[PDB]
Amino acid sequence: GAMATLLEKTRQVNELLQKNNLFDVQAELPYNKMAMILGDILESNAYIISSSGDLLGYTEKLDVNNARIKNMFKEKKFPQGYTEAVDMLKVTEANIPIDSDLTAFPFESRELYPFGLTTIVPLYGAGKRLGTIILARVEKSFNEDDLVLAEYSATVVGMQILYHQSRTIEAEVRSATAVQMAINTLSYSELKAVHAIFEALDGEEGRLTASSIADEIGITRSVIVNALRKLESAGIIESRSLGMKGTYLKVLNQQFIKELEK
Amino acid sequence: GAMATLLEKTRQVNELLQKNNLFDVQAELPYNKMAMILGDILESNAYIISSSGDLLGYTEKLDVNNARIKNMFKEKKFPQGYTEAVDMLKVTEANIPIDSDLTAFPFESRELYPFGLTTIVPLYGAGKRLGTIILARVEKSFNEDDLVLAEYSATVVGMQILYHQSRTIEAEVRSATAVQMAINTLSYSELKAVHAIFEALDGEEGRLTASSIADEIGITRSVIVNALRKLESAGIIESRSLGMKGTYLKVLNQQFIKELE
């Protein structure tokens, strides 16, 4: 039955994607396996795009009988602006024809697959946009059965993404709060000093002559140094004394500069 | 339109639960609103059980006719071990009759609800058991349309639970790193000052006089104030100066005192 068929597919999705962790560390794309499962169950080509527009994984059915080794290693790339455009879609769009710029088919293929259809499914979970799932079928349309399964699949993918994010979050906030406290522990004296330090110390890593720079900024010569010992003891940079040459520094938290240029 | 009906319901679930954050902080149960939405769309009473067997939220349809304003305040309680038992179910079990011990209906109602049916839906996401959703209907059976919707609903709830877990780790590590690094910026002097500052406060808010603290503990004021502007710049207390009268402070990180003691 249509409903029994749909149900069994949702069960297959559950067994394969809800009851397993599918983040492939060291894969070409971390979610290629997840995309493959989705494309199989949904009988589609499938692409998983992060909330920032990065392709996280995809599956395209290979034409085995006509395969050519030269063509098999080509990386799928979406046209300039496609990932930003899909992000503007806030609800599912189904059966997008190939003449739309939202088609998942390369634009060269518009002639080859005039009836190719694309369905774009925003991934929302817990109020957040988590990315987007894109499905493409050369021949069949997406019916209402397919849309339910697609929406079901998006939530399962959303959970995988939310779970992967959770494993990172502890180390992320530890570093952000550290940057924030180090920024707070600064005066105008040391801060505009720090600003110029990263300016001269271009590349994030390089040598520095704190004394010389002091003149460049019109800041007291002890004040310049106070920012240094604060940041390094706070744990954001590394230093070794070069003697007359100066002191050589190393940026250890790269999100710092983003917070200071804000 | 059986399929169109299901799709519209999944979309209502999306609009209401996928596109909103639904953790009711400082509420009775954080997921009471989530349970109500689910019970509405699934035409059931609904219970949300955490991975550890704690009831996180539920909704039961009130009968206006027999309402007693005092009986409306009773906390829902399951037979001991029921919430732990449901965790041993690893796949959905639907249309559980009232004669089973896994029924969601209290047994007192078992006489009044001959056809009461219970459906238990494990919440799995990303390989983890995230809890369980329990659905109860007076009579109508859970057909395949309902199970699809129910399974759909379970993933959506799972996302909420997972999202809350990450925001709980985020706020904990934010508070620990803030407290601990603030301690590291304190000398023997500044520590002994802050200690008595919190003793003087005695609780999360209060008034204190910087001069007096120096006199009471024998540390020059500069040290006392150096610690204050340190704690306030670190973002652990809020302050407004009353001048000669003194200074008013507010504890913003309550796990600080535990770490200092």
| C-alpha closest to that of B159 among A170, A155, A51 | A155
**What are the φ and ψ backbone dihedral angles of A130, each rounded to 5 degrees?**
-100, -5
Contact B243, B193 (CB under 8 A): no
Nearest CB among A7, A18, A144 relative to B4 is that of A144
Name chain B contacts of A166, Cβ cutoff 8 Å.
162, 165-166, 169
Burial group, residue B100, by CB count within 10 angstroms (0-12, 13-18, 19+): exposed
Is A187 near chain B, with CB under 8 Å?
A: no
User: Is residue B51 domain-shared with residue B8, that is, in the same domain?
Assistant: yes
Q: Are A229 and A256 in contact, with CB atoms under 8 Å apart?
A: no
A73, A118: one domain: yes
Residues A14 and A142 in one domain: yes
Residue holding tokens 């109508």?
Answer: B140
User: How many domains is chain A partitioned into structurally?
Assistant: 2
Whether residues B169 and A174 touch (CB distance < 8 A) is answered with: no
Residue with tokens 């939202």: A102
Question: In angstroms, rounded to a whole number, what is the distance separating the alpha carbons of residues A219 and A216?
Answer: 8
- Tell me, yes or no, whether A144 and A44 share the same domain: yes
C-beta of residue A30 within 8 angstroms of C-beta of residue A57: yes
Instruction: Indicate whether B137 and B44 sit together in one domain.
Output: yes
A165 shares its domain with A250: no
Listed residues A122, A147, A178: the one ending a domain: A178
Name residues whose C-beta falls within 8 Å of residue B90's C-beta, 6 or more positions apart in sequence.
B122
Q: Decide: helix, strand or coil at residue A240.
A: strand
| Token pair in block for residue A189 | 């004296």
How many Cα neighbours within 13 Å face the side chain of A242?
Answer: 13
CB distance B252 to B235 below 8 Å: yes
Tallying the residues shown for chain A, one arrives at 262
SS3 B141: coil
CB atoms within 10 A of CB A149: 25
Handedness of CA A93, A98, A99, A101 (dihedral sign): positive
Structure tokens at B261: 């003691």
Q: Which residue is it, tokens 């997406």?
A: A142
Q: Which residues of chain A neighbour B163 with C-beta distances below 8 Å?
A: 125-128, 162
B229–A contact, CB cutoff 8 A: no
Structure token digits, residue B196: 């008595």
- List the strands of the sheet with A237-241, edge to edge: A205-208, A247-251, A237-241
Residues A68, A169 within the same domain: yes
Residue type, B66: N
What lies within 8 Å, CB to CB, of A211 at 6+ separation is A221, A224, A246
Distance from CA of A60 to the nearest CA of B (A): 24
The closest alpha carbon to A45, from A3, A12, A78, belongs to A78
CB under 8 A, 24+ apart: contacts of B221-226 = B223/B187, B223/B189, B223/B190, B223/B193, B224/B193, B224/B197, B226/B190
- Per the structure, the complete domain to which residue A51 belongs is given by 1-178
Domain final position from A178, A209, A241: A178
A131 vs A52: CA distance, rounded Å:
7
B187 to chain A, any CB pair closer than 8 A? The answer is no
Q: Could you give the CA distance from residue B18 to residue A70 in angstroms, rounded to a whole number?
A: 43
Residues forming beta bridges with residue B237, ordered by sequence position: B251
**From CA B198, how far away is CA B236, in angstroms rounded?**
12
Residue A191 Cα, gap to closest chain B Cα (Å):
14
Separation of CA A86 from chain center: 15
- Give CA–CA dist A89/B80, Å, rounded: 48
C-alpha span between B50 and B131 (Å, rounded): 4
Instruction: Report the residue of chain A nearest B153, measured CA to CA.
Output: A152
**Pair A231, A253: CB distance under 8 Å:** no
CB pairs under 8 A between A and B: 152
Name which of A85, A81, A57 is nearest A160 in CA terms.
Answer: A57
Q: How far apart are CA B258 and CA B238, in angstroms?
A: 19
Ramachandran region of residue B79, left (φ > 0), alpha (ψ -120 to 50) or beta?
beta
Chain B contact present for A8, CB below 8 A: no
Q: Indicate if B11 and B56 belong to the same structural domain.
A: yes
CB A184 to CB B19 under 8 A? Answer: no
Looking at CA atoms only, how far is residue B9 from chain A in angstroms? Answer: 10
CA torsion through residues A72, A74, A77, A80, sign: negative
Q: Are residues B40 and B116 in the same domain?
A: yes
CA distance B257 to A247: 39
Sequential DSSP letters for A16-53 = IIISS----TTSSSTTHHHHHHHHHHHTSEEEEEETTS
Could you give the dihedral angle defined by the CA atoms of residues A35, A36, A42 and A47, in that order, rounded to the nearest 10 degrees? 30
Long-range CB contact pairs, B11-16, < 8 A, 24+: B11/A151, B12/B41, B13/B37, B13/B38, B13/B41, B13/B149, B13/B152, B13/B153, B13/B156, B14/A124, B14/A151, B14/B156
Give yes or no for a contact between B124 and B157, defined as CB atoms under 8 angstroms apart.
Answer: no
- Starting at the earlier edge strand, list the strands of the sheet with B237-243: B205-208, B246-251, B237-243
B160 touches A at CB < 8 Å: yes
Domain boundary among B149, B177, B205: B177
Task: Give yes or no for B7 touching A (CB within 8 A).
Answer: yes
Chain A within 8 Å of B12 (Cβ-Cβ)? no
Compute, in degrees rounded to 10, the torsion defined by CA atoms A228, A234, A238, A240.
Answer: 60
- Chain B positions touching A145 (Cβ under 8 A) are 3
Give the CA radius of gyration of chain B.
26
Beta bridge partners of B57: B48
Q: Are residues B18 and B147 in the same domain?
A: yes
Q: Give me A224's structure tokens.
A: 């310049």
CB nearest to A159's CB, from B155, B181, B230: B155
Question: Which residues in chain A (59-118) have CB-CB distances under 8 A to chain B?
Answer: none
Q: What was the experiment behind these coordinates?
A: X-ray
Token look-up 């068929």 returns A5
If you count them, how many residues does chain B have? 261
- List, in sequence order, the alpha helices (H) in chain B: 2-13, 32-42, 82-86, 107-110, 144-184, 188-201, 210-217, 221-234, 255-260
User: Hey, is the C-beta of B21 within 8 angstroms of any chain A C-beta?
Assistant: yes
The verdict on A92 and A203 lying in the same domain is no
CB atoms within 10 A of CB A157: 30
Q: For A162, which of B11, B147, B163 is closest by C-beta distance?
A: B163
Instruction: Name which of B57, B93, B146, B153 is nearest A156 in CA terms.
Output: B153
For an interface test with B, the pick among A143, A162, A165, A185 (most B C-beta atoms closer than 10 Å) comes out as A162
Amino acid type, A72: M
Shortest CB distance from B18 goes to which of A11, A148, A155?
A155
For residues A197 and A152, state if they share a domain: no
Task: Tell whether the torsion through CA atoms of A133, A160, B18 and B90 is positive or negative.
Answer: positive
